[PDB]
Symmetry: D2
Subunit: 154 residues, 4 copies
């Protein structure tokens, strides 16, 4: 690590979100969470994520590396970071890297929670349709770095 | 007119909205309008527009054309069309041109209404702060063309 | 027509070219045309267009509508306007619409000539590779509108 | 460091250059360097860099931090990395970070040399106009990291 690495990464993260639409989403989620509460907001955002997932159909793949390549292909259009797949004996581990940065210094955690909920719904629908098990959800998890999220599929 | 003009304008309007964020806003507004109703949805969207307007402060202008230039300067960053000012003896007409096109063939009117509400709130707050009258709202009006809106300030 | 149509089209054309790279290309072409002359500049730009065309391989199509769809798919990424195919008994007409606008008021014709040359080379290579005749070039032609070009394949 | 850092940085650098214009510049510089030689190509690239610098006038600053802020403001529009100023007793060091990545695996060094020349001309003109000394050029230097450059002003 060094100062130059910090400057480069900070500049890259700053150039990640486009003005106008992202701020509108931030205000919408802030207002809705202020109005209706936390649990209801999370459930609603998960439902919205599922509905958004329904619009984009992934082609039927056969191997996991096909899944990572296709998910990266779809996510590169939205500028929504990168994804890594790690298989295990009975688990699937989802690493999400380079999350869109927060837009307000006083509402970073709210934004992160909202984005995590939307992505959780998206991944849940995508994995359910491709041939997974419909009785198991995706568990969310924090990691030390701010710009990364962990997901577990059991 | 001609077919070439139609092709050019259609291609330009197609290249107007960025993928990902705009579709997310569309799903959010569709779900909220389906859930809470119409009047409450419009009121909430107007409030969101006001809050979004509060974030971007326009510099203090002195003439109407300066306001026109500043509003276009702010709107060119969002790709939210163009604006024209027409003053009168006691009225002010706001022409909004090249609105972001609809994303779904079955929800064009819903999208138009939502975008009109958000823009109405935005213009209301912007005009109120700069030195207008706080007891008069902005009246909305449709025009023959689908991509244009008329606003009246009395 | 109307004033509103002019405002909308002008704003759309203004939002067509990204800053930095396009201005760099403009300075490149102005300097090279000033240095080496006209005929050599056109020949060099045609060669560059062919070389650029070699990098992007269009999939093997079978009908003309497939060709226009593929060309539109490729050009939508560069923001290089739109293309229309018109077949005849022994001719093929290429209509190019919504050309990237000029960047300097004093060098509009130079920019248009350069862009026409590079597009002529690009289309020449694509049409030659897909199964056309290698002994016939693409003839350029000006049309009344400044933002449109005609190409003839005999 | 870790694998995740490499994935994030690689994805960010991949999303740095827009298609079409950048490839056109790459082909132009490759052809010109193949045709006219090395020294002449570098001289012409420096000249066009100065010409491009002439188009964008920096406001008259009074301190070095104003200069870094203004140069970053200008460069953020082109997506041309970031700049750091380090003053010394009689020297000035220009750190350029997050350079636009190479587009071809077989021409990375050619692209680096061309981009370095263009940036050298740009910085030379910019520093000359603002009140520097006209008899001293900017010396270029490479650093261990591929995506960073050092410039010396004596």
């Amino acid at each position: 690590m060094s100062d130059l690495q910090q400057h480069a990464l900070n500049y890259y993260r700053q150039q990640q979100l486009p003005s106008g639409w992202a701020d509108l989403f931030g205000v919408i989620v802030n207002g809705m969470m202020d109005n209706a509460g936390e649990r209801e907001g999370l459930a609603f955002l998960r439902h919205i994520g599922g509905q958004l997932a329904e619009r984009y159909p992934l082609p039927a793949a056969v191997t996991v590396v096909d899944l990572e390549r296709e998910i990266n292909r779809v996510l590169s259009l939205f500028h929504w970071g990168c994804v890594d797949l790690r298989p295990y004996e009975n688990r699937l581990e989802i690493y999400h890297l380079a999350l869109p940065a927060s837009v307000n210094s006083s509402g970073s955690v709210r934004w992160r929670m909202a984005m995590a909920a939307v992505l959780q719904g998206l991944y849940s629908r995508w994995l359910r349709e491709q041939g997974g098990v419909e009785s198991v959800p995706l568990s969310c998890e924090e990691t030390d770095s701010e710009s990364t999220l962990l997901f577990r599929y059991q």
